[PDB]
Protein backbone atom coordinates (compact mmCIF):
# COMPACT_ATOMS: atom_id res chain seq x y z
CA UNK A 1 0.00 0.00 0.00
CA UNK A 2 1.43 3.32 -1.21
CA UNK A 3 0.22 6.52 0.49
CA UNK A 4 -1.78 5.20 3.43
CA UNK A 5 -1.25 4.53 7.12
CA UNK A 6 -0.92 1.80 9.72
CA UNK A 7 -4.36 0.25 10.29
CA UNK A 8 -3.68 -0.68 13.84
CA UNK A 9 -3.34 -4.25 15.07
CA UNK A 10 -6.42 -6.42 14.60
CA UNK A 11 -8.63 -3.54 13.32
CA UNK A 12 -9.26 -5.47 10.09
CA UNK A 13 -10.28 -8.82 11.53
CA UNK A 14 -11.20 -10.43 8.20
CA UNK A 15 -7.78 -9.76 6.70
CA UNK A 16 -5.83 -12.87 5.80
CA UNK A 17 -2.22 -13.50 4.87
CA UNK A 18 -1.49 -16.28 2.39
CA UNK A 19 1.86 -17.85 3.24
CA UNK A 20 4.03 -20.19 1.18
CA UNK A 21 7.16 -20.01 3.30
CA UNK A 22 6.65 -16.25 3.10
CA UNK A 23 3.81 -13.78 2.62
CA UNK A 24 2.79 -13.69 -1.02
CA UNK A 25 -0.83 -12.53 -1.14
CA UNK A 26 -3.78 -11.30 0.87
CA UNK A 27 -7.29 -12.55 1.26
CA UNK A 28 -10.59 -12.23 3.11
CA UNK A 29 -12.33 -14.55 5.51
CA UNK A 30 -15.94 -15.01 4.42
CA UNK A 31 -16.86 -17.73 6.94
CA UNK A 32 -15.06 -20.07 9.38
CA UNK A 33 -13.95 -22.41 6.61
CA UNK A 34 -13.50 -20.22 3.51
CA UNK A 35 -11.27 -17.46 2.16
CA UNK A 36 -11.60 -15.40 -1.00
CA UNK A 37 -8.52 -14.10 -2.81
CA UNK A 38 -7.37 -13.45 -6.37
CA UNK A 39 -6.86 -16.20 -8.91
CA UNK A 40 -3.40 -14.86 -9.70
CA UNK A 41 -2.62 -15.79 -6.12
CA UNK A 42 -2.88 -19.47 -6.97
CA UNK A 43 -0.14 -21.67 -5.52
CA UNK A 44 0.11 -25.19 -4.15
CA UNK A 45 0.81 -25.64 -0.43
CA UNK A 46 -0.76 -22.48 0.98
CA UNK A 47 -0.93 -21.77 4.67
CA UNK A 48 -3.60 -19.25 5.66
CA UNK A 49 -2.63 -16.89 8.45
CA UNK A 50 -5.43 -15.23 10.41
CA UNK A 51 -5.31 -12.58 13.11
CA UNK A 52 -2.00 -11.16 11.83
CA UNK A 53 -0.54 -7.73 12.15
CA UNK A 54 3.22 -8.05 11.96
CA UNK A 55 3.76 -10.98 9.61
CA UNK A 56 7.33 -11.54 10.87
CA UNK A 57 6.60 -11.72 14.60
CA UNK A 58 4.31 -13.98 16.63
CA UNK A 59 2.16 -11.47 18.52
CA UNK A 60 -0.22 -13.95 20.05
CA UNK A 61 -3.51 -13.58 18.12
CA UNK A 62 -2.63 -15.66 15.10
CA UNK A 63 -4.26 -18.78 13.70
CA UNK A 64 -2.19 -20.79 11.24
CA UNK A 65 -4.26 -23.13 9.13
CA UNK A 66 -3.39 -25.13 6.01
CA UNK A 67 -5.61 -24.70 2.98
CA UNK A 68 -7.17 -27.95 1.88
CA UNK A 69 -8.53 -26.83 -1.43
CA UNK A 70 -8.29 -23.98 -3.92
CA UNK A 71 -10.85 -23.11 -6.56
CA UNK A 72 -9.98 -20.71 -9.33
CA UNK A 73 -12.94 -19.17 -11.17
CA UNK A 74 -13.71 -21.27 -14.30
CA UNK A 75 -13.42 -18.26 -16.62
CA UNK A 76 -10.28 -16.74 -15.20
CA UNK A 77 -8.13 -15.36 -18.00
CA UNK A 78 -4.60 -14.78 -16.77
CA UNK A 79 -3.78 -12.66 -19.78
CA UNK A 80 -6.54 -10.12 -19.19
CA UNK A 81 -7.01 -10.82 -15.46
CA UNK A 82 -10.71 -11.04 -16.21
CA UNK A 83 -12.55 -13.02 -13.48
CA UNK A 84 -9.60 -12.79 -11.09
CA UNK A 85 -11.12 -14.63 -8.13
CA UNK A 86 -10.26 -17.77 -6.15
CA UNK A 87 -11.82 -19.57 -3.20
CA UNK A 88 -9.67 -21.26 -0.55
CA UNK A 89 -11.04 -23.88 1.81
CA UNK A 90 -9.47 -24.20 5.27
CA UNK A 91 -8.39 -27.63 6.53
CA UNK A 92 -9.87 -26.88 9.92
CA UNK A 93 -12.31 -24.17 10.82
CA UNK A 94 -11.06 -20.82 12.05
CA UNK A 95 -12.00 -19.85 15.57
CA UNK A 96 -13.88 -16.55 15.27
CA UNK A 97 -13.25 -13.83 17.82
CA UNK A 98 -12.63 -10.11 18.28
CA UNK A 99 -9.48 -10.40 16.17
CA UNK A 100 -10.63 -12.98 13.59
CA UNK A 101 -13.93 -12.25 11.93
CA UNK A 102 -15.85 -12.87 8.71
CA UNK A 103 -16.72 -10.15 6.21
CA UNK A 104 -20.15 -10.15 4.57
CA UNK A 105 -20.75 -10.68 0.85
CA UNK A 106 -22.59 -7.82 -0.93
CA UNK A 107 -26.31 -7.98 -1.60
CA UNK A 108 -25.77 -5.29 -4.17
CA UNK A 109 -22.94 -3.53 -6.02
CA UNK A 110 -21.46 -0.36 -4.61
CA UNK A 111 -21.81 2.92 -6.53
CA UNK A 112 -19.16 5.39 -7.71
CA UNK A 113 -18.08 7.87 -5.07
CA UNK A 114 -18.57 5.21 -2.39
CA UNK A 115 -15.72 5.25 0.11
CA UNK A 116 -13.90 2.00 0.62
CA UNK A 117 -11.20 0.49 2.79
CA UNK A 118 -8.30 -1.23 1.08
CA UNK A 119 -5.89 -3.14 3.28
CA UNK A 120 -2.74 -5.22 2.82
CA UNK A 121 0.94 -5.63 3.55
CA UNK A 122 2.62 -4.99 0.24
CA UNK A 123 5.02 -2.52 -1.39
CA UNK A 124 4.76 1.03 -0.10
CA UNK A 125 6.84 2.73 -2.76
CA UNK A 126 5.87 3.84 -6.27
CA UNK A 127 9.51 3.90 -7.26
CA UNK A 128 11.79 1.33 -5.67
CA UNK A 129 11.14 -1.46 -3.21
CA UNK A 130 10.01 -1.36 0.44
CA UNK A 131 7.85 -4.03 2.09
CA UNK A 132 6.25 -3.19 5.46
CA UNK A 133 5.75 -5.86 8.09
CA UNK A 134 2.47 -4.36 9.34
CA UNK A 135 -1.04 -4.27 7.99
CA UNK A 136 -1.63 -1.07 6.12
CA UNK A 137 -4.80 0.75 5.21
CA UNK A 138 -6.06 3.17 2.57
CA UNK A 139 -9.40 4.91 2.18
CA UNK A 140 -10.32 5.46 -1.45
CA UNK A 141 -13.51 6.17 -3.43
CA UNK A 142 -14.77 3.99 -6.18
CA UNK A 143 -14.15 5.91 -9.39
CA UNK A 144 -16.62 6.14 -12.23
CA UNK A 145 -16.38 3.55 -14.98
CA UNK A 146 -15.65 6.32 -17.46
CA UNK A 147 -12.64 7.42 -15.48
CA UNK A 148 -11.62 3.77 -15.14
CA UNK A 149 -11.82 2.75 -18.79
CA UNK A 150 -10.16 5.93 -19.92
CA UNK A 151 -7.07 5.07 -17.88
CA UNK A 152 -6.85 1.57 -19.36
CA UNK A 153 -8.38 1.70 -22.85
CA UNK A 154 -9.77 -1.64 -23.95
CA UNK A 155 -8.58 -3.37 -20.72
CA UNK A 156 -11.45 -2.91 -18.31
CA UNK A 157 -14.37 -5.32 -18.30
CA UNK A 158 -17.71 -5.54 -16.46
CA UNK A 159 -15.99 -7.64 -13.79
CA UNK A 160 -13.66 -4.82 -12.83
CA UNK A 161 -13.72 -1.52 -11.07
CA UNK A 162 -11.30 1.24 -10.25
CA UNK A 163 -10.69 2.89 -6.94
CA UNK A 164 -8.42 5.57 -5.66
CA UNK A 165 -7.24 8.84 -7.13
CA UNK A 166 -6.60 9.97 -10.68
CA UNK A 167 -3.73 12.18 -9.56
CA UNK A 168 -1.81 9.15 -8.30
CA UNK A 169 0.21 8.93 -5.08
CA UNK A 170 -2.18 6.61 -3.23
CA UNK A 171 -2.67 3.03 -4.39
CA UNK A 172 -2.40 -0.70 -3.95
CA UNK A 173 -0.58 -2.91 -6.47
CA UNK A 174 2.13 -5.37 -5.32
CA UNK A 175 0.75 -3.78 -2.16
CA UNK A 176 -1.21 -6.94 -1.79
CA UNK A 177 -2.68 -8.84 -4.56
CA UNK A 178 -5.75 -10.72 -3.40
CA UNK A 179 -6.48 -8.22 -0.59
CA UNK A 180 -9.93 -6.91 0.38
CA UNK A 181 -11.80 -3.81 -0.68
CA UNK A 182 -14.56 -3.19 1.85
CA UNK A 183 -17.31 -0.60 1.39
CA UNK A 184 -20.20 0.00 3.82
CA UNK A 185 -19.36 -3.19 5.67
CA UNK A 186 -19.40 -5.43 2.61
CA UNK A 187 -16.69 -7.06 0.56
CA UNK A 188 -16.88 -5.25 -2.75
CA UNK A 189 -13.40 -5.78 -4.14
CA UNK A 190 -10.25 -7.86 -4.56
CA UNK A 191 -6.89 -6.24 -5.33
CA UNK A 192 -6.24 -7.46 -8.87
CA UNK A 193 -3.95 -5.20 -10.95
CA UNK A 194 -2.96 -1.68 -11.98
CA UNK A 195 -0.23 -0.39 -14.28
CA UNK A 196 2.81 0.58 -12.29
CA UNK A 197 1.79 1.78 -8.84
CA UNK A 198 0.08 5.00 -7.75
CA UNK A 199 0.83 6.64 -11.08
CA UNK A 200 -0.95 9.71 -12.41
CA UNK A 201 -4.05 8.54 -14.28
CA UNK A 202 -3.35 5.00 -13.18
CA UNK A 203 -5.83 3.98 -10.43
CA UNK A 204 -5.96 0.48 -8.95
CA UNK A 205 -8.11 -2.22 -10.61
CA UNK A 206 -10.26 -4.50 -8.48
CA UNK A 207 -12.28 -7.67 -9.08
CA UNK A 208 -15.95 -6.70 -8.82
CA UNK A 209 -17.17 -9.22 -6.19
CA UNK A 210 -20.85 -8.36 -6.50
CA UNK A 211 -20.83 -10.11 -9.87
CA UNK A 212 -19.69 -13.32 -8.21
CA UNK A 213 -21.89 -13.82 -5.20
CA UNK A 214 -23.98 -16.58 -6.80
CA UNK A 215 -20.81 -18.42 -7.84
CA UNK A 216 -19.29 -18.07 -4.37
CA UNK A 217 -22.35 -19.31 -2.52
CA UNK A 218 -22.85 -22.25 -4.84
CA UNK A 219 -19.22 -23.26 -4.81
CA UNK A 220 -18.81 -23.07 -1.06
CA UNK A 221 -22.00 -25.03 -0.40
CA UNK A 222 -20.96 -27.80 -2.77
CA UNK A 223 -17.36 -28.16 -1.62
Does 174 belong to an annotated binding site? yes
Q: Is 214 a catalytic residue?
A: no
Q: Which of 23, 84, 126, 176 is catalytic?
A: 84
Q: For the CB of residue 74, give the shortest distance to Ca ion in the complex, in Å.
A: 34
- Decide if residue 134 touches Ca ion (CB under 5 A): no
Q: Is 40 a catalytic residue?
A: yes
Q: Which of 40, 53, 73, 119 is catalytic?
A: 40
Q: Is the dihedral of CA 178, 182, 209, 32 positive or negative?
A: positive
Give the binding range for Ca ion (CB under 5 A) out of 57-65, 75-83, 97-105, 142-150.
57-65
Does 130 belong to an annotated binding site? no
Q: How large is the C-alpha radius of gyration of the chain?
A: 16
Does 172 belong to an annotated binding site? yes
- Count of residues that interact with Ca ion, criterion CB under 5 A: 3
Q: Is 84 a catalytic residue?
A: yes
Q: For the CB of residue 95, give the shortest distance to Ca ion in the complex, in Å.
A: 16
Q: How far is CA 210 from CA 62, 188, 190, 214, in A?
A: 29, 6, 11, 9
Residue among 59, 68, 134, 220 that touches Ca ion (CB under 5 A): 59
Interface with Ca ion (CB under 5 A) = 52, 54, 59
Annotated catalytic residues are 40, 84, 177
Amino acid sequence: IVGGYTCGANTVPYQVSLNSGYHFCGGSLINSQWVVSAAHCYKSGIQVRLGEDNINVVEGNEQFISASKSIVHPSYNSNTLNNDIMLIKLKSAASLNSRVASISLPTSCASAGTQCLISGWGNTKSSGTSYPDVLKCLKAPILSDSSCKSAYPGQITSNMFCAGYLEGGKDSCQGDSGGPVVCSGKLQGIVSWGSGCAQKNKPGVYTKVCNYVSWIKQTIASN
